[model samples]
Target: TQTMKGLDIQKVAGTWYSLAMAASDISLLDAQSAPLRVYVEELKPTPEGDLEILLQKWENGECAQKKIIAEKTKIPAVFKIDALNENKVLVLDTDYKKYLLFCMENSAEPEQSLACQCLVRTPEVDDEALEKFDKALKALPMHIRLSFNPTQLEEQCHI
Candidate 1:
């Protein structure tokens, strides 16, 4: 059986709703004051034969897009893996010149208590893919170290 490499854009694409994380006990909605959604636009081959990612997020219903405009590092900007389980991926965004971790649900409507991780800026995670995410976070500012926990949504006020 052929195992998934995780970061494959085709597999990572679509809408991923936030769930839970290790660092904090808050949902994406609580952190951002809105629903957080990730949309993978395309998985184009780079000039060097590597893959490039085009990802966007819909927060509070507002579209905030972030594309991999450039690539200096050989690592993929977005590192996804199937370590957690099926229908779930560990997403890492190091293309920000900073790192961001997003534990994404493969399904459109994720359950209330799913697992997720967010690295503020440390590449010392158990998974290699997640380590890359840690590096990306290290390159970013402290204030941007955001974490999410889906269970927190239960306590959030439904506006």
Candidate 2:
């Protein structure tokens, strides 16, 4: 898979808002999304140089939260979330303003594999960013499909 060749971890750290995502599995689409919304609020490198991310969302009518640690890989921008077998993601594109990310949510077993794409903005994006987002989605492997239509995200998911 194509990945960002030279990722500047410090620059990539900070706040980001969800713009859209294309989910490849029915259950994944249902579990992590609310129709067209999914938010990943913060990502930063720890003192140990490992990656950490915060996810906050509305679940059960109250904000639910999950803190994730990404185990490092030799390859830049590639990481195993350390929560499941072969559950990993890659940074496909970014300019420290907009980012395109893809993942194999459950690639451990063929019966449960999921291809996912997420487009994010540092608090938001504009038309040019949206255009880039569309192109990135269209460029993914054919097996990936938009389980829900992409839409603009407009809230902070701070936990």
Candidate 3:
């Protein structure tokens, strides 16, 4: 699993919006499409000293929302979240400024049902973030490919 190195839970906690997505499934456009907003609402140490995170995705309009809590596993920078369905998520990249790259695989199959998307601090795209995303794409072990969806950047981010 490609994980964030020296990830600071404090620095990483905050709000983010989807910028681009490249999924193994071409039909996975809902997450790739706009009007999507993800909030890493809170991240703090749990009672057992483990990390806990409250995440929410407001998509397909504000009326529909998906919320979940991620708990830290034994491994660092790795978390388990249950939303929509059980998902294993890995944080591939984050600079705590530009963008955050998350790669997730549903328990549906092997080499199947895989989706990797990114969230930015703002709706606007930047060169620095693009460069970072390029490096992240290259670093990806799988042939995960993403396309640039022409967006206003200021438009609604629906899930």
Candidate 4:
């Protein structure tokens, strides 16, 4: 389970766009998935070492925005999202200038959810970055390998 070593939140903190995403449940890729399909807009590192996740989603033909805090953990790049103790978000890799890889898991109860995301600094991602993202996905456990898909985020959401 190799992950980003010595991840400095400050280096990767700034504006970001969701280049791609995947989930264990196929339904999360649907247009109705709202918050589940939300696009990550920014990663703001707080002085407390926690991360402020700014997100955007399309709902009922309107764009909506939300922000959540990812509480810091003892581990280098892992954080607990919100109050649910079962939820976790990990930064798998990042170059700081090009792309970022993230994985999230929620094994709360009746069903478990797994997801991964690739964030890009610009709208256009190069082949090298995409390949890196694919390689990371392949390195994950079989059960964790999700059906990755490129995001079709609406530009109006952020503007």
Candidate 5:
């Protein structure tokens, strides 16, 4: 898959909410038992054009926030996050206002792992946003399962 062209990290930085997600391995996306289900909270752009991903997840029956730095690569919208076994993240599409679509892939192994997420600036998702998300999912080369109605991790935990 290709990343968005002429992408500016600063423009995409700030609060974001995960609305939909898809994964090549269905088991990895379970709302309660999945280890890879993460809810994106915000994006912080560093001076060097890298990205700081502020995320939350359901952990031990509670919501826990975590941060991970994704270093900028030679590609404009592709970044490398060492924490995820050097997985590469690609900004597939984004208007930086209403919705953002991104994907992560681990291609080093024989059994490649791939996941994609659709994020909106607001908590609620509209029909137009969902249509954009569905287009992105259909464009993926591999077979993936999507969750249009994902678990709201934030609702389950106290702020």
Candidate 6:
């Protein structure tokens, strides 16, 4: 597994889907107003060592998009090769003030869907990250809150 650095990390960027949440009391749909289909697109590298994320949602079988940029505030932590799969790598940032964790994977397709997990650190995020997430949420025109059954915990893990 290889740890991404500099523009290499940006090259690995693209739209990512939120497959599942690793934490309780927080969810991918918790911030969005549509059917819980959250994804990132139009990723561009910023000088601040973070990729500008474009947020999008799928509702009524339609796709709505919004663009927001986030900066990397700290060095990525828990960088390691995948234990289960040698070709895959795993990295995490536990110090992020608002969003606690992030995961990335490499793909041959540039327009691939990567997986991401957004977690709240202290139930509040810094002004910048919060602003980006908020802007992404506001860009959507339709509003709908889907209900997720917590009883599904047996099927998945929560942090």
lDDT of 5: 0.74
lDDT of 3 by residue, 22-57 (tens): 555554434433222243433444555344544455
Clashing pairs in 2: none
Candidate 4 structure quality by residue, lDDT tens digits, 10-94? 8878888887776555655445443456678889989889988888867777877778788999997888885222377889999
Writing each residue's lDDT as its tens digit, candidate 1 over 9-64 gives 33333233222233222353344333332333344445553434454544554556
Q: Pick the candidate with the highest TM-score.
A: 5
lDDT per residue (tens digit) for residues 126-158 in model 6: 445434333433432223322223232112111
Model 2, poorest ten-residue lDDT window?
Answer: 143-152
Those runs of model 6 whose alpha carbons end farther than 4 Å from true positions after fitting are 1-8, 21-23, 26-37, 58-63, 76-159
RMSD in order of candidates: 14.1, 4.3, 4.5, 3.7, 2.8, 14.4
Best by lDDT: 5
Per-residue lDDT of model 5, residues 35-151, tens digit only: 667778889999889999988767787778778888898898899885544377889889998889898777585144677888888777556877877787775654555443433
CA lDDT, every prediction? 0.36, 0.57, 0.57, 0.70, 0.74, 0.35
Report, for all candidates in order, the number of backbone clashes: 9, 0, 8, 0, 0, 3
Q: Candidate 3 regions off by >4 Å?
A: 30-63, 107-110, 139-152
lDDT tens readout by residue for model 2, 1-39:
466788766666877666555554455445533431245
The runs of at least 3 residues in candidate 1 whose Cα sits more than 4 Å from the true structure, single-residue gaps closed, are 1-26, 29-36, 59-61, 69-159
lDDT of 6: 0.35
- Residue 72 local lDDT, model 6: 52
List residue ranges in candidate 2 displaced over 4 A. Answer: 31-38, 84-86, 110-112, 115-119, 139-159
Error of 3 at 157 (Å): 3.5
